[PDB]
Design an enzyme around this catalytic site. Structure first.
Site, PDB file in Angstrom:
ATOM      1  N   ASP A   1      -7.931   9.945  16.952  1.00 24.92           N
ATOM      2  CA  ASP A   1      -7.676   9.360  18.257  1.00 24.92           C
ATOM      3  C   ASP A   1      -8.599   8.178  18.480  1.00 24.92           C
ATOM      4  O   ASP A   1      -9.568   7.984  17.735  1.00 24.92           O
ATOM      5  CB  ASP A   1      -7.860  10.395  19.376  1.00 24.92           C
ATOM      6  CG  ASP A   1      -9.278  10.949  19.453  1.00 24.92           C
ATOM      7  OD1 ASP A   1      -9.679  11.718  18.548  1.00 24.92           O
ATOM      8  OD2 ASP A   1      -9.995  10.617  20.427  1.00 24.92           O
TER       9      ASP A   1
ATOM     10  N   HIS B   1     -21.515  37.654  11.592  1.00 27.77           N
ATOM     11  CA  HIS B   1     -20.267  36.965  11.900  1.00 27.77           C
ATOM     12  C   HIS B   1     -19.269  36.852  10.748  1.00 27.77           C
ATOM     13  O   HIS B   1     -18.160  36.359  10.942  1.00 27.77           O
ATOM     14  CB  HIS B   1     -20.570  35.566  12.455  1.00 27.77           C
ATOM     15  CG  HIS B   1     -21.421  35.576  13.692  1.00 27.77           C
ATOM     16  ND1 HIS B   1     -22.795  35.690  13.656  1.00 27.77           N
ATOM     17  CD2 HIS B   1     -21.087  35.519  15.004  1.00 27.77           C
ATOM     18  CE1 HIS B   1     -23.269  35.704  14.888  1.00 27.77           C
ATOM     19  NE2 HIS B   1     -22.255  35.601  15.726  1.00 27.77           N
TER      20      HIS B   1
ATOM     21  N   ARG C   1     -17.776  19.282   5.253  1.00 30.26           N
ATOM     22  CA  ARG C   1     -16.988  19.395   6.471  1.00 30.26           C
ATOM     23  C   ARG C   1     -15.846  18.385   6.441  1.00 30.26           C
ATOM     24  O   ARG C   1     -16.060  17.202   6.190  1.00 30.26           O
ATOM     25  CB  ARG C   1     -17.860  19.158   7.711  1.00 30.26           C
ATOM     26  CG  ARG C   1     -17.049  18.944   8.987  1.00 30.26           C
ATOM     27  CD  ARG C   1     -17.918  18.782  10.240  1.00 30.26           C
ATOM     28  NE  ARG C   1     -17.296  17.890  11.226  1.00 30.26           N
ATOM     29  CZ  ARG C   1     -16.155  18.133  11.865  1.00 30.26           C
ATOM     30  NH1 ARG C   1     -15.488  19.260  11.658  1.00 30.26           N
ATOM     31  NH2 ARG C   1     -15.684  17.248  12.730  1.00 30.26           N
ATOM     32  N   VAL C   2     -14.628  18.859   6.681  1.00 29.52           N
ATOM     33  CA  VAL C   2     -13.457  17.987   6.697  1.00 29.52           C
ATOM     34  C   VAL C   2     -12.810  18.090   8.075  1.00 29.52           C
ATOM     35  O   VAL C   2     -11.904  18.900   8.291  1.00 29.52           O
ATOM     36  CB  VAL C   2     -12.428  18.383   5.590  1.00 29.52           C
ATOM     37  CG1 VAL C   2     -12.934  17.938   4.236  1.00 29.52           C
ATOM     38  CG2 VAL C   2     -12.201  19.892   5.575  1.00 29.52           C
TER      39      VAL C   2
HETATM   40  N1  LIG Z   1     -12.951  11.965  20.659  1.00 36.20           N
HETATM   41  C1  LIG Z   1     -13.557  13.009  20.145  1.00 36.20           C
HETATM   42  N2  LIG Z   1     -14.745  13.366  20.654  1.00 36.20           N
HETATM   43  C2  LIG Z   1     -15.366  14.420  20.146  1.00 36.20           C
HETATM   44  F1  LIG Z   1     -16.508  14.694  20.693  1.00 36.20           F
HETATM   45  N3  LIG Z   1     -14.936  15.207  19.145  1.00 36.20           N
HETATM   46  C3  LIG Z   1     -13.730  14.830  18.641  1.00 36.20           C
HETATM   47  C4  LIG Z   1     -13.003  13.759  19.086  1.00 36.20           C
HETATM   48  N4  LIG Z   1     -11.837  13.638  18.379  1.00 36.20           N
HETATM   49  C5  LIG Z   1     -11.914  14.635  17.550  1.00 36.20           C
HETATM   50  N5  LIG Z   1     -12.991  15.422  17.605  1.00 36.20           N
HETATM   51  C6  LIG Z   1     -13.234  16.627  16.713  1.00 36.20           C
HETATM   52  C7  LIG Z   1     -14.648  17.242  16.811  1.00 36.20           C
HETATM   53  C8  LIG Z   1     -14.571  18.627  17.497  1.00 36.20           C
HETATM   54  O1  LIG Z   1     -14.680  19.704  16.606  1.00 36.20           O
HETATM   55  C9  LIG Z   1     -13.143  18.635  18.025  1.00 36.20           C
HETATM   56  C10 LIG Z   1     -13.060  18.370  19.534  1.00 36.20           C
HETATM   57  O2  LIG Z   1     -11.703  18.381  19.957  1.00 36.20           O
HETATM   58  O3  LIG Z   1     -12.395  17.693  17.185  1.00 36.20           O
HETATM   59  N1  LIG Z   2     -28.931  38.214  20.581  1.00 37.13           N
HETATM   60  C1  LIG Z   2     -28.002  37.337  20.892  1.00 37.13           C
HETATM   61  N2  LIG Z   2     -28.321  36.028  20.873  1.00 37.13           N
HETATM   62  C2  LIG Z   2     -27.387  35.135  21.188  1.00 37.13           C
HETATM   63  F1  LIG Z   2     -27.778  33.890  21.143  1.00 37.13           F
HETATM   64  N3  LIG Z   2     -26.111  35.393  21.536  1.00 37.13           N
HETATM   65  C3  LIG Z   2     -25.811  36.722  21.547  1.00 37.13           C
HETATM   66  C4  LIG Z   2     -26.693  37.726  21.240  1.00 37.13           C
HETATM   67  N4  LIG Z   2     -26.089  38.953  21.343  1.00 37.13           N
HETATM   68  C5  LIG Z   2     -24.888  38.632  21.700  1.00 37.13           C
HETATM   69  N5  LIG Z   2     -24.599  37.338  21.856  1.00 37.13           N
HETATM   70  C6  LIG Z   2     -23.260  36.798  22.267  1.00 37.13           C
HETATM   71  C7  LIG Z   2     -23.276  35.338  22.769  1.00 37.13           C
HETATM   72  C8  LIG Z   2     -22.519  34.439  21.776  1.00 37.13           C
HETATM   73  O1  LIG Z   2     -21.250  34.063  22.235  1.00 37.13           O
HETATM   74  C9  LIG Z   2     -22.299  35.378  20.584  1.00 37.13           C
HETATM   75  C10 LIG Z   2     -23.192  35.066  19.375  1.00 37.13           C
HETATM   76  O2  LIG Z   2     -22.925  35.984  18.308  1.00 37.13           O
HETATM   77  O3  LIG Z   2     -22.442  36.744  21.093  1.00 37.13           O
END
Ligand SMILES: Nc1nc(F)nc2c1ncn2[C@H]1C[C@H](O)[C@@H](CO)O1
Ligand SMILES: Nc1nc(F)nc2c1ncn2[C@H]1C[C@H](O)[C@@H](CO)O1
Ligand SMILES: Nc1nc(F)nc2c1ncn2[C@H]1C[C@H](O)[C@@H](CO)O1
Ligand SMILES: Nc1nc(F)nc2c1ncn2[C@H]1C[C@H](O)[C@@H](CO)O1
Ligand SMILES: Nc1nc(F)nc2c1ncn2[C@H]1C[C@H](O)[C@@H](CO)O1
Ligand SMILES: Nc1nc(F)nc2c1ncn2[C@H]1C[C@H](O)[C@@H](CO)O1
Lengths: 232, 237, 237, 232, 237, 237
Positions: free
Chosen positions: A204, A4, A87-88
Site C-alpha cells: 500500500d 507458545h 521475515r517475508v
Molecule cells: N502502512 C503500513 N503501516 C504499518 F505500520 N504496517 C504495515 C503497513 N502496510 C503493511 N504493514 C504490515 C506490517 C504489520 O504486520 C501489518 C499491519 O497491517 O502489515
Molecule cells: N507472565 C505473563 N507475562 C506476560 F507478559 N503476559 C502474560 C503472562 N501470563 C499471561 N500473560 C498473557 C498476556 C499476553 O497476551 C499473553 C502472553 O503469553 O498471555
C-alpha cells in the site's frame, strides 16, 4: 514444547521463513514446499516444515507487532535450534518513486519502540541485519531477474499514528517501507545470538492511499533461493 | 470492511468481548452465545456475533501485544460503531498474596511501552478504565459469589524481559497482574472516545510457582466470562 | 515527631482530610467536627483531630504542589499510621460540558512531573485512586442529590505553563480538571501501601470563564466536605 | 570557500578519504597519491587532492568527535560537490577474539549521542552505511587478501566514559569497535544526500589495555581499491 | 490583584526577600525593617513592605517546592514590577568539609525536576543566579566577618527520595547543599527577565548529623538576613 | 605521555589557556609569552609553555566540539597536574543588544549534548565556572577599561542545526553566546576536581548580520587574551 509452541527439537529446520499472517504461511507451505506437515497450532499460529529442492525448510507466522514476533523468534532460537530467520512481510511506502509490488530488503530498521533502548541502556542501538544474508538475497533477486531496493525500514508501534507529520521525517531520511516488526526481530537475533533478515512487498501507499496471503510470490522465491546460496 | 476486518456495519454488536487467542473466541461463542455467526476471518482472527439472554453481543480475538490489539479495537470503534470493549485474558502475579485463579480487574494499567507518550506530548497519561464498567463488573462478581481485586495491571512490551529488575519494582508498587494489552486499549479508548475494561484471571505466578487443577482453572475462566457478560446487562439498565 | 509534624503516634486519626489552602483546616474543624483539638503548627500548617457522627477524623493542609503534599502525606502514612488520605480542593476545567462549581472525582491523575518516573524506573506508572474510596464518594454524592463526574485529572508542575497547546491535548483525552497534587499523592500511596482519593470542585474554566458569587462558592465547598465526610462512614461499612 | 574550508568548487574530487588526524592525511597524500597538492589549511585541517592509478582522489582530516566531523562532511557535500565519503580511522576493541591491526567495516553505527534523535523526532534512527560501498570494500579486501569483519561500530561522545559497565552491553551486542564519528557521518550523509562508509583499524584493546599517522596501510589500500570497483 | 496575591502595583518594593517558612516573614519585618505594613494575606501567605537604612524592601514566604515558589516569583515579576528575588532558607549538606550552620550561596542549581526541560525544548538549561547579586552577597558576608561558600546547589522534587545513591553522585560533583527551590526560581527569572539569588544555611548534614541549640540557629538565621540585606545596598552602588 | 599528548610531567604549567584553533595557540605563544617552547604536537594540536610577566603559563588548542576538548582537558588535569583551564574563543550572538566584538564570560553553559546527563544519573547538572575565576576576569576587564557581560552560553552539538528553532528559545531565555565547548569543559572540571572558565568575543550575530573591521576585530581578540592572562595574576594573589 515451549509456552507458545507445541513441538519438539527437530520439528523445525535450522531456517524458518516468517510472514505476519498465519494463513500466508499455510499458503507458502502448500505452494512452495514438498511433503509439508503442520508442526504447531497453538493460538492459531500455524507452523509447517517441508522441503524446497531437497532442502529442509520451515515456515510459521508471527502475528502483528514487535511484542508478538519477539515471543516467537526467541522461542525458536532457544528451544528449537533455529539459526536463521527471514521475515517475508508487507509494508507501506512513503517515497514518491516507490510503487506497489516493489520488493525491499531491510539492511537496517528504525523504530519508535522502546524495546532496544531497554536493552541498550537507553542509548541508540543500530538494528541491522546480517550482511551475508542481505547479500545472498540481492544475488538471488538478480538471478531471478527481479528488482529489489536495499535500505532502511521503519518499525511502527501504532499502525494508526496520531502524528502524521512523522511521515515527512521518514521520507526525508529515505525510509523505503513502514511495517511493524523488523527492529524487534533484529534486537532479538542479537540478544539470543542468531541471524536475521527482513524482506517486504509494498502492499500500500501511505500518500496515495492505494492498497492491494497470496500473490506475493517473488518475495518468497527470493527468500528460498537466497537460503540455498547461503548453504554453498 | 477494513484491511484487517472483512465485515460490514451491523455485523458487530455495540459491545465486544476480546480474548487474546483467536481460538478462545470460538470457544466463547460456542459456549455462551446463542444463534452465533462468524463475521470475520481475515488473518485468522475469528469474530462472532450472537446473543446472551436476548442481548446482542460480539466476541473477537485481538492477538498478543499492544500494537496488535490497538489495530483491532481502533477499527471496531471508528468503523463498526462499537461503544464498549471488554478484554478477557490471563496474567502473571507478582504479589505474594495474589493467588492462582484470582480474578483481577484493571482499573488502571502501567506500561513500558511508549505509545501513550507519543499521544500525550511525552508526559504521563494515566491509562484508566471506564468507572461504570468497573463498577458493573464488581457488582456482577458479587452476585456470583466470586471475589475480585481491583487495581493496577502492567502491560509489558517484552514477554521475555532482558532484566528481571521490574518485577521487584512492580511488586513494591502493588501491581496486581502482568499482561500485554490493557495500557494500549485504554489509550485507544481515550483517543477515539469509547469505553473499555480489562479483566484477567491469574494464570501464573512469577514469585514462586505452584499450580492447581485443570477442571478448577477452566471453572475460573468461565466465571470470568460470566462476570463480563453479566456486567453488560447491568449496564443496559 | 517528624521534621514537618510535631506530634506523636495517636494524635491523628487513621483518616485525614487535606485542603490546599491552610486556612481551610480550622474552618472545617469548627464547622464540621466535634470536640476538635489542635495537633500541629510547625511552619504554620495547622492540624486538627475530632469526630464526625462518632467517627474519628483529622484535617490539615498540604500546600500547593506535588513536592509539598508528598512530604506531608508520606510522614502521616509512615509515622502516624494514617490509612486513608482525601484531598479536597479546586481545579480548572478544559472541557466545554464541564461547568463551574461541578464536583469531580479523580480516579486517575496524569502529570507533567517526573516524580513517578523516578519511582518506576522511567516507565509509565498509572497513578490511580482506591476504587472503593471512589465508589463511596459517588454514592455519598448521590445521597446528597449531587451528581459527580468521575474521570482523569491532570497534575501540573507549572501553574503558568510556557506552552498553551497542552490544553488542547488534555481536552482531546477527556481530562476533567487541572490541579497540582493528585499524581503526587497517588504515587506516595502506592509507595507506602496506603489509600488515597482527590475530590475537586471546578473553580475556574480555562478559556471562556464565567463568574461566581462568594455565597455560591461556600455552598459548593461545604457540599464537597459533606461528600468527603459521608463517604468515610460508607467505607466503614 | 566555506566557513571552515578555503577552497573553490573543483579543488576536491567527488570522492574523499577522511582520517581523524590531519597528519595522517598528509602522510596518505605523500604515500599513495600522485601529483598531490594542498587544497586547505584553515585551523590546521590539511586537505589534499591527487591521483591514484589515474583516478582523481582527495584526502582530508576531520578532527575528533561527531561535532567536528559533522561540520567538515557537510561543507564538502554542499559546496564542493562531494558524492562519496570514506572514513579511515582507528578504534578500540571490546570483544575477546578481536586483535590489534584487525580491519573492521561498519555497516552500522550505534551511539550515545543525541544528534540523530534531534533529527528523527527523538525516535531511533538506524545509522547505516551505503550497501554498495560496504560490498565494494569487502570485495577489495578479498582481492588484496586481507581479512575484514563487517558489523556494528559504537560512536562515543566521551573517550573517557564515567560508565565502564556500558562496555559489557557493547560486548553482549557484538560491537566490533569503539570510535567517535561513524554515527555522525551517517546522519549527515542522509540529511544532505550523499553516501558514506567507515573503515577502521583496531589500534587498542579496551579490556587488555594494549596500544599501538603511519603503518595503517591495509586500511588505505582497501579504501582506494574499493573506489575503483565502484567506478565500474 | 493576582490569583495568589491580593494587592496593586506599588505595594511591593522592586526587591523581595522570600523565606520558605511563612512564619519567617512577620519575624523579619518586625526585626529588621522599619515602618512595615501588611500587603498580602491570601491563603495565609503574609507579605510586608518597609525600609532598611532608607531602602525600600519587601518580604513574603514562597512555600516548599518548585511548583509553589514558581507561582509567587512569577506573579511578583510580571504584575508588581519586582526586579530582584532573594530566597533565604536552609539546606542539607552531603560534603564532609561542609559543616552545620555554614552559609552557602548558590551560583547554580541542579535539579531532578522537569520544569526547565519543558521550557528548554528538552535540552539542558543551566539555571544560574545573577553574577552581581552573588558577588554582592560574598562581599557583604566578608564585611560581617563571615566566610561564605559559593557553588552548586541541588533542588529536589522529593524530600524523601526512593533512591539514596544520588547522594553519592551529588557529593562526587561538589554539590554544596540540597534544598527544593533554586532551580525553579532561576528558571522563572530567565523566563521573565528578572534577577534572582538563593542564600542558605546548612541546617542538617545528610549522613552523619550533628546537633545545634535553638540559640545557635537564630544567630545563624539572623546573620543570613543581615547578609542578604546589606548585599542589596552594595548592589545599589 | 598519553595517546593524545606526547609530553612529560612538568612540561605544562598549572594554568593553561585554550583556543579552539591549534594555529591560534602559536599566535598567542608568539605574541604574549616570553621564552616559549613547544611541548606537544600529536595530531597537530600544538602546545606551548613560556612565561608572562614572570608567571609560568601554557597555551594549547582543543579542537572543535565537546568530545574533542573533553579529551584534552581531562588528560591535562589528571596527567599533567593542571589546576586551571581558561578557554578563549569566539561565539555567535542571538540577543539584539549584544553586539559584535563584545566580551562574554560564561558563568554558566546550557547544551543540547547528553554527556552531563550520562554523568548525572539523567538529571539536570548545572554546568558552571569557578566563581573566583569569573571574578578575577571581571576585575581584569575593568582595569583595562573593557566592558564584559556575564551570563549563559550555549554549547551546541551541531554547528549546522537541522531546525533553527532553538535560536528563538535561546534568545527568549537570555543566552549570551553560542559556541561548542563550555558545557563539556565545565563537566570535566567538576568530575575530576579542577577549575575552569570560558571567555568569548562575539564573532558573528545570527540575528541580522553587520560586520566591522579587521584591525578592530583583532584588537578585541587581543584584549580577551590580555584579560585572561591578567586574571591569572590577580588569582595568584
Ligand atoms: N502502512 C503500513 N503501516 C504499518 F505500520 N504496517 C504495515 C503497513 N502496510 C503493511 N504493514 C504490515 C506490517 C504489520 O504486520 C501489518 C499491519 O497491517 O502489515
Ligand atoms: N507472565 C505473563 N507475562 C506476560 F507478559 N503476559 C502474560 C503472562 N501470563 C499471561 N500473560 C498473557 C498476556 C499476553 O497476551 C499473553 C502472553 O503469553 O498471555
Ligand atoms: N487552573 C488551575 N490550574 C492549576 F494548575 N491549579 C489550579 C487551577 N485552578 C485551581 N487550582 C488548584 C490547584 C492548586 O492547589 C492551586 C493553584 O492555584 O489551586
Ligand atoms: N578506545 C577508543 N575509544 C574511542 F572512543 N575512540 C577511539 C578509541 N581508539 C581509537 N579511537 C579513535 C576515534 C577518535 O577519533 C580518536 C580518539 O582518540 O581515535
Ligand atoms: N535535607 C534537606 N533536603 C531537602 F530536600 N530540603 C531541605 C533539606 N534541609 C532543608 N531543606 C529546606 C528546603 C525546603 O524548603 C525545606 C524541606 O524541608 O527545607
Ligand atoms: N555561530 C556559532 N555557532 C557555533 F556553534 N559555534 C560558533 C559560532 N561562532 C563561533 N563559534 C565558535 C565555536 C566553535 O569552536 C567554532 C565553530 O566554528 O567557533
Amino acid at each position: 514444547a515451549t509456552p507458545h509452541i507445541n513441538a519438539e527439537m527437530g520439528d523445525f529446520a535450522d531456517v524458518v521463513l516468517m510472514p505476519g499472517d498465519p494463513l500466508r504461511a499455510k499458503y507458502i507451505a502448500e505452494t512452495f514446499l514438498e511433503d509439508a506437515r503442520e508442526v504447531n497450532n497453538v493460538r492459531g499460529m500455524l507452523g509447517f516444515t517441508g522441503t524446497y529442492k531437497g532442502r529442509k525448510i520451515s515456515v510459521m507466522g508471527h502475528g502483528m507487532g514487535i511484542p508478538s514476533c519477539s515471543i516467537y523468534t526467541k522461542e525458536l532460537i532457544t528451544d528449537f535450534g533455529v539459526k536463521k530467520i527471514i521475515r517475508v512481510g508487507s509494508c507501506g511506502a512513503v517515497l514518491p518513486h516507490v510503487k506497489l509490488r516493489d520488493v525491499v530488503i531491510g539492511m537496517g530498521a528504525c523504530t519508535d519502540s522502546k524495546v532496544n533502548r531497554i536493552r541498550f541502556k537507553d542509548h541508540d542501538f543500530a538494528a541491522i541485519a546480517d550482511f551475508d544474508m542481505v547479500r545472498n538475497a540481492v544475488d538471488a533477486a538478480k538471478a531471478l531477474g527481479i528488482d529489489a531496493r536495499v535500505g532502511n525500514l521503519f518499525s511502527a508501534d501504532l499502525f494508526y499514528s496520531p502524528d502524521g507529520e512523522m511521515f515527512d521525517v521518514m521520507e526525508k531520511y529515505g525510509i523505503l517501507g513502514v511495517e511493524m516488526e523488523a527492529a524487534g526481530i533484529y534486537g532479538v537475533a542479537a540478544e539470543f545470538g542468531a541471524k536475521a533478515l527482513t524482506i517486504c512487498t509494498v502492499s500500500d501507499h501511505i500518500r496515495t492511499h492505494e492498497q492491494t496471503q497470496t500473490t506475493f510470490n517473488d518475495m518468497i522465491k527470493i527468500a528460498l533461493e537466497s537460503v540455498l546460496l547461503g548453504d554453498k
